[PDB]
Amino acid sequence: MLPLSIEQRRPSRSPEYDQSTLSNYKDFAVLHTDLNLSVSFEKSAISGSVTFQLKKLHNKSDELHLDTSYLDVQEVHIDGSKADFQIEQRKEPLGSRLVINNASCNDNFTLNIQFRTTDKCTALQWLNSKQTKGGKPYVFSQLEAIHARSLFPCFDTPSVKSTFTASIESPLPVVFSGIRIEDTNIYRFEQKVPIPAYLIGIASGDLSSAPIGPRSTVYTEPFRLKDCQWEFENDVEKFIQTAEKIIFEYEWGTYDILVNVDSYPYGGMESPNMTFATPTLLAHDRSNIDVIAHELAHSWSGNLVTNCSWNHFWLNEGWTVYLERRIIGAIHGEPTRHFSALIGWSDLQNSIDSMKDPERFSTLVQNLNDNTDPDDAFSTVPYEKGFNLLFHLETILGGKAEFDPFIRHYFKKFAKKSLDTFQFLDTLYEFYPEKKEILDSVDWETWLYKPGMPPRPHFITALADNVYQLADKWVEMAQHLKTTEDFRSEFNAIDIKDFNSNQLVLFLETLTQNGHSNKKPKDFDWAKFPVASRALLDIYQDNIVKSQNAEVVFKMFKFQIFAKLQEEYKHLADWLGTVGRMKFVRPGYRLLNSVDRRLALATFDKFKDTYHPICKALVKQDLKL
Numbered sequence: 001m002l003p004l005s006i007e008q009r010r011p012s013r014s015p016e017y018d019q020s021t022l023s024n025y026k027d028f029a030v031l032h033t034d035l036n037l038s039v040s041f042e043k044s045a046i047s048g049s050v051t052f053q054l055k056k057l058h059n060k061s062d063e064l065h066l067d068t069s070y071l072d073v074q075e076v077h078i079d080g081s082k083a084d085f086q087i088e089q090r091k092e093p094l095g096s097r098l099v100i101n102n103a104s105c106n107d108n109f110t111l112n113i114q115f116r117t118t119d120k121c122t123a124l125q126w127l128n129s130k131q132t133k134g135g136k137p138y139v140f141s142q143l144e145a146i147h148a149r150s151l152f153p154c155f156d157t158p159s160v161k162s163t164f165t166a167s168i169e170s171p172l173p174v175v176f177s178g179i180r181i182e183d184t185n186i187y188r189f190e191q192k193v194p195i196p197a198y199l200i201g202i203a204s205g206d207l208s209s210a211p212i213g214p215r216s217t218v219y220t221e222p223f224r225l226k227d228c229q230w231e232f233e234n235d236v237e238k239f240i241q242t243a244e245k246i247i248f249e250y251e252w253g254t255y256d257i258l259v260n261v262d263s264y265p266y267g268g269m270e271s272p273n274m275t276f277a278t279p280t281l282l283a284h285d286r287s288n289i290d291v292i293a294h295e296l297a298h299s300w301s302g303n304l305v306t307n308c309s310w311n312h313f314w315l316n317e318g319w320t321v322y323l324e325r326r327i328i329g330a331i332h333g334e335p336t337r338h339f340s341a342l343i344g345w346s347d348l349q350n351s352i353d354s355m356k357d358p359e360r361f362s363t364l365v366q367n368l369n370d371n372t373d374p375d376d377a378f379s380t381v382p383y384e385k386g387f388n389l390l391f392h393l394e395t396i397l398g399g400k401a402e403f404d405p406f407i408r409h410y411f412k413k414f415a416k417k418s419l420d421t422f423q424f425l426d427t428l429y430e431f432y433p434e435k436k437e438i439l440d441s442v443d444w445e446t447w448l449y450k451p452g453m454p455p456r457p458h459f460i461t462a463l464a465d466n467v468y469q470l471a472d473k474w475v476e477m478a479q480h481l482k483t484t485e486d487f488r489s490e491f492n493a494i495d496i497k498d499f500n501s502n503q504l505v506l507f508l509e510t511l512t513q514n515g516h517s518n519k520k521p522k523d524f525d526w527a528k529f530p531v532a533s534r535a536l537l538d539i540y541q542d543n544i545v546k547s548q549n550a551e552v553v554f555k556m557f558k559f560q561i562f563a564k565l566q567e568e569y570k571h572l573a574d575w576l577g578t579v580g581r582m583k584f585v586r587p588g589y590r591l592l593n594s595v596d597r598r599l600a601l602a603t604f605d606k607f608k609d610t611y612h613p614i615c616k617a618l619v620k621q622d623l624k625l
Ligand SMILES: CC(C)C[C@H](NC(=O)[C@@H](O)[C@H](N)Cc1ccccc1)C(=O)O
Pocket: 144, 145, 265, 266, 267, 268, 269, 270, 290, 291, 294, 295, 298, 317, 378, 583
């Protein structure tokens, strides 16, 4: 019942074809996937075999085509018998197609492929005994978006979802994105809800665990175990129950968290039954846990209901950001939800302003070919433009109460399936017959296919106003007060006593933006007011300078750089050797290079090999390499 230009862009058949896979997934049904693996720290390889139970769907070739990337494929059997196969030469950026002749007799058949990972594997990071805080080797995966094919041969598309079983042999503890079949050096798991390959998660190392709720356990290195338990144990069950009330019962069983090694490059990864989390989430006060509301919301938007291709990634991340903000809003109130959206708005702006090819990459729905790296399309746009389209819909349809019935209908309809934007729109229209005119007033063309910032909503700015006022006040007084004594008369620790970490982050951000009002048009620099910038750090030492929150600490370093306080460059350099999260590492190196390149390249050369392959790659070229 949707509008014409949408009708016009929609394919004749949904879900829309995924151009990022070399597999012939439309030709088969994947009924079950079993992983039988062995982890070798000695060789830094995972080897073994994957077994698929498949069903031919109906001049057939007839061939199986699977995705691989830098795998060593060793043998292939169908129904117990050796099957002819050939790997095609690599084509970037999608990899090496594996081609299998299936002379199998029946429509239903079993496919077994023996393989091992290689040194060029893009799915894993390996750490040796000397690299981990705790003294033993460690490995973990990160498969999103198309790295699963570098871990095992598969139909590597989010259109394909399958139950899994897994046996993993390792000389150290293993966690997996499934429920453990309980107790050895052989870890068995089951994932009884069908999942896409990109959600598979594995880690192995010196892991211990501790309960953080009635259905939640945290896993991490022993030295950090109790800190992690304290950080999560007061809040995780509350988050789950909050999400369940907004949507419906959580059906995955356990909700566990793996707090990864310091080289971990993302904030989190929503592997089912084992969220992967950055240790920089641990602040010792519980400031950063919304990253957990985020991964938790994925249980519904992403895991249960999945985007069919990377062109429609907004369905995953936009919904998740929307749901995440509903959780925090339900717990903390609307001003908190709106504050989070306000920070997200400025993240969106920066992302689009910093963009290479904004005309292409800032549209909500993407158009990747088979020549486009799906990475190249990941930005803040699917998150925040996605969120803003949903927030707009919430509003015009009558508010949370009117929208929540749709949310439940949507996640129920597509549970365990994959979909495209067009199917999302059909569902929206089928659900609101009485509201057809309101939905037809939505400029679907601008929201879905046009580049740039969408129309700006009217967020409640209550929790940011105090922050903006102070940053403005600091910008002004920097040009008026001279001696530190002067500053202490105007400012004191009292003025940020009520600032949470998000507010501190926004404050320090606004300062490098030199205020949130054009009183001083010129982007003058803090470098020329050392007494003020030094007084800042002094007066606010308790809450900013002494903070154990990596988010605030990072901003503190950045303010220090924007103010070119040279005596602090050393602490930035060394701190950067302590974290691996891209969000801090990449910008950190950009910051340090703009004030001391001889130190930035010296620092990188020192820590380069401690970072995740991805983070090392991007920092390498950030530093002109
Ligand atoms: C949005 C933030 C709360 C956290 C953010 N993480 C996510 O959105 C995760 O759920 C994503 N799985 C991170 C991701 C997406 C696409 C490709 C690679 C990695 C991150 O930066 O890690």
